[PDB]
RNA sequence: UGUAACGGGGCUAAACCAUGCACCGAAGCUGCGGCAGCGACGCUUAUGCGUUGUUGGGUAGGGGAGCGUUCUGUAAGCCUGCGAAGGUGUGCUGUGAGGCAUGCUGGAGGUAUCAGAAGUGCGAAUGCUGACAUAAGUAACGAUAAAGCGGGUGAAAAGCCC
RNA sequence: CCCGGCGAGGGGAGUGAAAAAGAACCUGAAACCGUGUACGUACAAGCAGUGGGAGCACGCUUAGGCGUGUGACUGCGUACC
C-alpha cells in the first residue's frame, strides 16, 4: 500500500504512517492537509495515472512542525581576479506525517 | 656572503 | 598500581631512546631487564635507570611485589634542545641542536 | 642535489620502516654457575661451558 | 527519501555459457561487457560490481568481418629498450586464442579498481566444455 | 589607541583550522594551507550541488532502462509511451517502483505500450 | 627611532630581502609607519549654536520637569552634612544646583557629595544640563540665563 | 621514446546520403520554496504588508550598508572568586564580517546601551623577530707518525695513571 | 625515606587555595614530536578534495536506510598570489 504525489515541484513515494519532509507549505503546525494531485496508487493491483492524477485519490496528512535545514556554505572564487565572495543558506520545510491513501 | 662559482666569471657569465 | 618513573633532560635524541623504549614496552619487568642488559646501546643504559627507578618506586612507595610487575606504558618525548655552534668553513655557522629527550617509564600490574 | 619538496612526515616514517631493533631471545643458562649469558660467551663470574676459566 | 543503492554484500549474480562460435566478436563483448557491469538490472550502482559470472566457449572460433581477420593489429609495449611487439589477429588466435575475447572485453569494462574487478567474473575458455559444472551455468544467447 | 590584534587573529584562523578536519597532512594542520584547501572544497560543493541533479538523474535514467528492456522495450520507446499515454506525468526517480515492485513496474510498461500501438 | 642610517646589508648578492634601513616599520624594534603627535580636537560650535542648544536643553528639562527653580537656595555653614540633610528633604541625589551668585559654604559642601555639583550662573555647560538627574537653578539665577542666552 | 592521423574498445554499419518519429543532454526555459533593488495595484501611509511584473556573472573602478577590535563618555551604573579576561570544546543563531549560551581550563578583572575617537582587521612584499620542521640519525669527527698487552683507579677505561 | 655514580633526574612525604604554582615556576595558543584507542591501508597511478557511497566502531531511537568517527568503491576534479 503505497501511493504517490506532487507538492514541492516534486513527487514521492509514500506509505501511510510514513513521515515526509516536503517543500515549506502555508498550514499552521497541528492542521491537515490534502494533497489532490496524486500520481499513482498501489495495492494488488494499481491505479497509474490516465492524464496525470487518478480521480478518486486524495492523500491526507497532517503538518507536523516547520523548520530550517542544516546550513549549506555557498562558496564563490575566482583565481587571479581579487574576487570572492562566501554565503549562507539555509531552507525551509515543512514535515507531514501521512495518514491518507485512499484508493 | 656568496658562493664561489656566483663570484666566478667563467661559470657564472656562460650565455652572451 | 601505575607508579611510575623518569629521566629528565637525558642527553640523547629521543628517535635515538626509542628503539630501546620499542623493545620493552609491554614485557614483564623481569624480561626487559635481561633485554636491556644485552642491548648495546647507550639509550639502554638509560632506559635501564629509569626502570630500574620505577621498580624500586612501586616497591618502596605503592604495593610492590615486582615479580607481577610489567612495563605496561613507556614514552620518550623530544626534550628542549641545546643550540651550538660550529662551523664549517669560509665563514659559515652551522646550528647544530644537541638534542634532548624526556624518558618516561609506567610499571604497574594490570 | 636537493629536495624540490619537504618529504612529508608518514615519508620519514616509511623510511624507517626497517630501522628498528630486535631483542635477543637466544640469552642462554650456565649448566655449573647459574648465570644467564650470551651464548658461546664467558659469564659474569668467568664461567663458560660448566668449567671455570678465567678467576675475573 | 534517498534512492537505492546496491550493496556488495547482498548481489545476486548467477552464472551463464556463452558460445562465441560463429558470433562477431565485438557485438560479442558489448553484451559481456554490459552483463558484466550489471547494466542490466538495478545496475543503479556504478559503484558496485552487479554483473553476472559468464563463461565463453569456442573463442578460437570466435568471427570477425571485413579483412580483420588478417588485418587487425594488436599491439603492446614490453617497457623495454624499443619493445613494440605486435601481433595480428589470426596469429593471435593460433597462440593463445582466448586473449582476443579477453582484451576485447576489458576493454569496453570501465577504467580501474572495479572494472578490473569485473573482468574476474569472465571465464574464456579456448574449446568446448569447461570445468565449471559446479556453478550450474546456464546458457544464453546473443 | 593602539590595537593589540591577535585575539580575533586566531579566531580567524582557528575558523579555518575547523573547516578543514579531515584533510590530508598540511591541508589539516598548516593555516595557509588550510584555507586553500577550505575554499576549494567549498567550490566543488557549489558545483556538486548542480552535479548532484544530473548524477541521479541519470542513475534513475539507467535503470530505468534495464527495467523497461527486461520488460521488451527501449528507454526511448517506454518515456515516449507514457509522454503520449494520454498526457500524465511522473518523476524518473519515482520510476523507484523500478527496484522494489516490478509488477507495478511492468504495469506502467504495459500502459505506455498501449499508447504506442 | 635611534640607529644609525648605514644600510644592514648588499643590495645584491646575498640571498636576502632588499633591506634599507634598520629603522623600517617593516622591520622589528623602530618604526610605526603614520606616528601621531600631539594635536588639538578643539571644534568650532557657531554662538548661535550653543544658545540654540541650551535653549533645547532648558527646554527639554522643565517637559520632563527635571529643572526645578527656587527662591534663594543656600546652606548655613560649610558642612557637607548640612547639604546631605537639604537635599534629602528636598527629594534630591543626583542635582546640578545653579545658585545666584554662589557662596562659600553651599561650594564647600557638596565638593564631597559625588553626584551633586553648584555652579554659579554663567558656569553653567551643555553636558551637565544633561549630565544630572536633576538642575535645580534659584530663580535668581533664571533670570540671569534668560538673558545670556537672550 | 611506444600502437600513436575515430579519445579507446570495437565497428561492414556502430560508415556515408535522404526522409521521419523517438530519446539523452546545460548553472538556458519551466516547476516548488527563499532573499534583495526598482516598479506599478491593492491592504494601508513618524509605513509595512500582500500580491504582482521585472532585475540581481563580473577585473580596473564608482555608489550603498554593515561586523569586530583598542580607547572616552554614559558608568560611584551593570557583570564578576557562587569564577572576570585569555585558552579549549559544544550547542544554537545571522546573508556575511559575527553574536549568544554553556562544559573544561583559568584565577581577576569585564563592561551593555547609545554616542565619540583610531597604532582597527594579514598569506603572500627573496617582508621583520622568535620558535620548529626538512634533507637524516645521512655527511662528517681536521693531516695515513701506529699501535699491542699487563697492572692500578673507577659506577664505567681503546683514550687517564704505572 | 627510596632508585642512582655521597651524581643528573625521578618517585613518595610535607608546605600551600592550588605542586596539574617546584624555582627550566601566572595564563601556557600554534608550528613541531610522541604514547593510546576506533576505522581505513600491501592489484594500486595524478592539487588529495567534492557528489555518491557500502562496511566497521560507537551512541541513539524502541526499530525505522538516525547522530559521531572512519571512508572500500565511485562521478567530477591541474593549489594560492
Ligand atoms: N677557492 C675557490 C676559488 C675562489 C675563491 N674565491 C673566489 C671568488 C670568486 C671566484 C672564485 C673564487 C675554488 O675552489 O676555486
Ligand atoms: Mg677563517
Ligand atoms: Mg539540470
Ligand atoms: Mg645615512
Ligand atoms: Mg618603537
Ligand atoms: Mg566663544
Ligand atoms: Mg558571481
Ligand atoms: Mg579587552
Ligand atoms: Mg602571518
Ligand atoms: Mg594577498
Ligand atoms: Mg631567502
Ligand atoms: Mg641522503
Ligand atoms: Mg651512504
Ligand atoms: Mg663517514
Ligand atoms: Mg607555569
Ligand atoms: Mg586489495
Ligand atoms: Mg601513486
Ligand atoms: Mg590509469
Known amino acids: ?47 497509474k495515472i490516465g492524464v496525470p492524477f487518478v480521480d478518486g485519490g486524495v492523500i491526507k496528512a497532517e503538518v507536523v512542525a516547520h523548520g530550517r535545514g542544516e546550513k549549506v556554505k555557498i562558496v564563490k572564487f575566482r583565481r587571479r581576479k581579487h574576487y570572492r565572495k562566501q554565503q549562507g543558506h539555509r531552507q525551509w520545510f515543512t514535515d507531514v506525517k501521512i495518514t491518507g491513501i485512499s484508493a | 656572503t656568496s658562493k664561489w662559482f656566483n663570484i666566478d666569471n667563467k661559470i657564472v657569465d656562460h650565455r652572451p | ?82 643550540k651550538r655552534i660550529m662551523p664549517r668553513a669560509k665563514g659559515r655557522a ?8 624526556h624518558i618516561t617509564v609506567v610499571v604497574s600490574d594490570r | 642535489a636537493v629536495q624540490q619538496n619537504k618529504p612529508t612526515r608518514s615519508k620519514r616514517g616509511m623510511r624507517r620502516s626497517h630501522d628498528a631493533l630486535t631483542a635477543v631471545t637466544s640469552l642462554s643458562v650456565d649448566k655449573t654457575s647459574g648465570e644467564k649469558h650470551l651464548r658461546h660467551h664467558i659469564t659474569a663470574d668467568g664461567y663458560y661451558r660448566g668449567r671455570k676459566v678465567i678467576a675475573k | 527519501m534517498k534512492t537505492f543503492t546496491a550493496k556488495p ?21 558489448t553484451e559481456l561487457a554490459r552483463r558484466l557491469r550489471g547494466k542490466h538490472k538495478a545496475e543503479y550502482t556504478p559503484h558496485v560490481d552487479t554483473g553476472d559470472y559468464i563463461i565463453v566457449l569456442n573463442a578460437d572460433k570466435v568471427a570477425v568481418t571485413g579483412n580483420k581477420r588478417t588485418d ?59 570445468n565449471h559444472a559446479a556453478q550450474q551455468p546456464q546458457v544464453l544467447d546473443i | 589607541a593602539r590595537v593589540k590584534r591577535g585575539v580575533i587573529a ?58 523497461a528492456r527486461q520488460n521488451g522495450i527501449s528507454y526511448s520507446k517506454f518515456i515516449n509511451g507514457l509522454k503520449k499515454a494520454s498526457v500524465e506525468i511522473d518523476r524518473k526517480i519515482l520510476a523507484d517502483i523500478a527496484v522494489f515492485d516490478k509488477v507495478a513496474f511492468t504495469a506502467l510498461v504495459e500502459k505506455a505500450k498501449a499508447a504506442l500501438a | 627611532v635611534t640607529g644609525s642610517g648605514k644600510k644592514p646589508w648588499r643590495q645584491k648578492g646575498t640571498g636576502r630581502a632588499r633591506s634599507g634601513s634598520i629603522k623600517s616599520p617593516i622591520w622589528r624594534s623602530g618604526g610605526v609607519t603614520f606616528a601621531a603627535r600631539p594635536q588639538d580636537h578643539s571644534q568650532k560650535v557657531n554662538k548661535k549654536m550653543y544658545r540654540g542648544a541650551l535653549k533645547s536643553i532648558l527646554s527639554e528639562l522643565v517637559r520632563q520637569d527635571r529643572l526645578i527653580v527656587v527662591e534663594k537656595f543656600s546652606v548655613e555653614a560649610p558642612k557637607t552634612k548640612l547639604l546631605a540633610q537639604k537635599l534629602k528633604d528636598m527629594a534630591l541625589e543626583d542635582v546640578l544646583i545653579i545658585t545666584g551668585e554662589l557662596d562659600e559654604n553651599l561650594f ?9 555639583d553648584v555652579r554659579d550662573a554663567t558656569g553653567i555647560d551643555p553636558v551637565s544640563l544633561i549630565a544630572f538627574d536633576k538642575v535645580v537653578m534659584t530663580a535668581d539665577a533664571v533670570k540671569q540665563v534668560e538673558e545670556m542666552l537672550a
Not at chain 1, 519532509?21 to 494499481?46: S, Y
Not at chain 3, 623518569?6 to 628503539?19: C, D, I, N, P, T
Open chain 5, 72 to 130: 587487425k593489429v594488436y599491439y603492446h609495449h614490453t617497457g623495454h629498450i624499443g619493445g613494440i611487439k605486435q601481433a595480428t589477429f589470426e596469429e593471435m588466435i593460433a597462440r593463445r586464442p582466448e586473449r582476443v575475447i579477453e582484451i576485447a572485453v576489458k576493454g569496453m569494462l570501465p577504467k580501474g579498481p572495479l572494472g578490473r574487478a569485473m573482468f574476474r567474473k569472465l571465464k574464456v575458455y579456448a574449446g568446448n566444455e569447461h
Open chain 7, 108 to 116: 564647600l559642601a557638596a565638593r564631597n557629595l559625588h553626584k551633586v
Open chain 1, 1 to 47: 500500500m503505497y501511493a504517490v504525489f506532487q507538492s514541492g515541484g516534486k513527487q514521492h513515494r509514500v506509505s501511510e504512517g510514513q513521515t515526509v519532509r516536503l517543500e515549506k507549505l502555508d498550514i499552521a503546525t497541528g492542521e491537515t492537509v490534502e494533497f489532490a494531485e496524486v500520481l499513482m496508487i498501489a495495492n494488488g493491483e494499481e491505479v
Open chain 3, 1 to 82: 598500581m601505575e607508579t611510575i618513573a623518569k629521566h629528565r633532560h637525558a642527553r640523547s635524541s629521543a628517535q635515538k631512546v626509542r628503539l630501546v623504549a620499542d623493545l620493552i614496552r609491554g614485557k614483564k619487568v623481569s624480561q626487559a631487564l635481561d633485554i636491556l642488559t644485552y642491548t648495546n646501546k647507550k639509550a639502554a643504559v638509560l632506559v635501564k635507570k629509569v626502570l630500574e627507578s620505577a621498580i624500586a618506586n612501586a616497591e618502596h612507595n605503592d604495593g610492590a611485589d615486582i615479580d607481577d610487575l610489567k612495563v605496561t606504558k613507556i614514552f620518550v618525548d623530544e626534550g628542549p634542545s641545546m
Open chain 5, 9 to 29: 554484500e547482498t548481489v545476486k549474480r548467477d552464472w551463464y555459457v556463452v558460445d562465441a562460435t560463429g558470433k562477431t566478436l565485438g557485438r560479442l563483448a
Open chain 3, 94 to 101: 652551522d646550528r647544530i641542536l644537541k638534542r634532548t629527550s
Open chain 6, 10 to 67: 586566531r579566531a580567524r584562523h582557528k575558523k579555518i583550522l575547523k573547516q578543514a578536519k579531515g584533510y590530508y597532512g598540511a591541508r589539516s594542520r598548516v593555516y595557509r594551507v588550510a584555507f586553500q584547501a577550505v575554499i576549494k572544497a567549498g567550490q566543488y560543493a557549489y558545483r556538486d550541488r548542480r552535479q548532484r541533479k544530473r548524477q541521479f538523474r541519470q542513475l534513475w535514467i539507467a535503470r530505468i532502462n534495464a527495467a
